[PDB]
Amino acid sequence: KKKIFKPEELRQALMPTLEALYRQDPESLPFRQPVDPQLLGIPDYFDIVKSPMDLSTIKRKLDTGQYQEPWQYVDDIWLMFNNAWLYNRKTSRVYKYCSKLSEVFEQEIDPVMQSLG
Numbered sequence: 001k002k003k004i005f006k007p008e009e010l011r012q013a014l015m016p017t018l019e020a021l022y023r024q025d026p027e028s029l030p031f032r033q034p035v036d037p038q039l040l041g042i043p044d045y046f047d048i049v050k051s052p053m054d055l056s057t058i059k060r061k062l063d064t065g066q067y068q069e070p071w072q073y074v075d076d077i078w079l080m081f082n083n084a085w086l087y088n089r090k091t092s093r094v095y096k097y098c099s100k101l102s103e104v105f106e107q108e109i110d111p112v113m114q115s116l117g
């Protein structure tokens with residue numbers, strides 16, 4: 001159902017789910033900044049991931065009120081996870097850290113979504 005949200009109320013409801021990802025150490029560390037394929041020596045990264053997303057991009061979008069609806073925020077979190085599972089091998093540390101972050105997110109986001117509508 002349609003609902004108009006104030007960015008300030010989105011920010012205050014959704015920020016805590018984002019801060020819960022940030023406090024996962026070491027599991028959030030790969031996700032805190034945009035993937036720099038050159039710095040990381042993964043030059044195939046942009047062949048595989050066409051919509052990169054990371055926690056700092058998501059935090060900037062919350063702080064500039066670029067999310068109109070909660071589901072847009074969730075879509076960016078899920079894009080970030082999907083990108084990491086897609087690029088990384090099932091056996092790799094970043095894949096497992098991604099899986100850990102998605103479990104934390106799933107537990108944090110369920111009640112916040114209920115409370116927004």
Ligand SMILES: COc1ccc(N2C(=O)CCC[C@H]2c2nc(-c3ccc4onc(C)c4c3)cn2C[C@H](C)N2CCOCC2)cc1Cl
Nearest residue numbers: 026029030031032035040041042083084087088093094097
């Ligand atoms: C604490 O965890 C790590 C420490 C180093 C590394 N790294 C490596 O093992 C070798 C490459 C440099 C570093 C590193 N890799 C990646 C990496 C790689 C592939 C990826 O696909 N999708 C994503 C997101 C992604 C990220 C990131 N990094 C930097 C590493 C996490 N830093 C460690 C602590 O300071 C800030 C970040 C990875 C992790 Cl999980």
